[PDB]
């Protein structure tokens, strides 16, 4: 076993959301998919084989995966439609993922604090907390 699955492995469901629309206007998201995604609730599940780690999100707006090697830049394509550089660390128990995209970065961190999974989201100085617990 890991620290990574011990830490962040399952099923996790959205419960709180701070600055989420402030953050996505930051990033460049447009109005409607800000107010149709800002409802959402999604599950964001974890899972570790071998090196890859996959992080599925599952939302009644749209549902997307990535995996990755830790350290290894890979391509993304969000789901609010931007094409980004994304690498993804594990640096002091917490999940780092940093987008470049246009001369633009936003880091995402993933952390467990108590039985959570607490999300900061960062584009400038706007950060989003977002907090998930087990399904
Ligand atoms: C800005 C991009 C963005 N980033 C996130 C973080 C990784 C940063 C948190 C998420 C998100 N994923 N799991 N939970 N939340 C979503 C989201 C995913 C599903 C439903 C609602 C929001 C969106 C997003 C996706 C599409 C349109 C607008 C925003």
Redesign the pocket.
């Given at each position: 076993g890991s620290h990574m699955c011990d830490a962040f492995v399952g099923t996790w469901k959205?419960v709180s959301s701070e600055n989420f629309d402030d953050y996505?206007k930051e990033?460049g998201?447009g109005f409607a998919?800000?107010k149709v995604?800002g409802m959402?609730k999604?599950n964001?599940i974890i899972s570790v084989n071998g090196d890859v780690i996959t992080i599925k999100?599952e939302?009644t707006?749209?549902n997307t995966e990535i995996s990755f090697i830790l350290g290894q830049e890979f391509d993304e394509v969000?789901?609010?439609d931007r094409k980004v550089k994304s690498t993804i660390t594990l640096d002091g128990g917490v999940l780092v993922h940093v987008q470049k995209w246009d001369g633009k970065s936003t880091t995402?961190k993933r952390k467990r604090e108590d039985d959570k999974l607490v999300?900061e989201?960062v584009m400038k100085g706007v950060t989003s907390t977002?907090v998930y617990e087990r399904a």
């Open positions: 959205l996505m990033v998201v998919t800000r995604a959402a999604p964001m999100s939302s707006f749209k969000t789901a609010d995402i999300v989201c977002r």
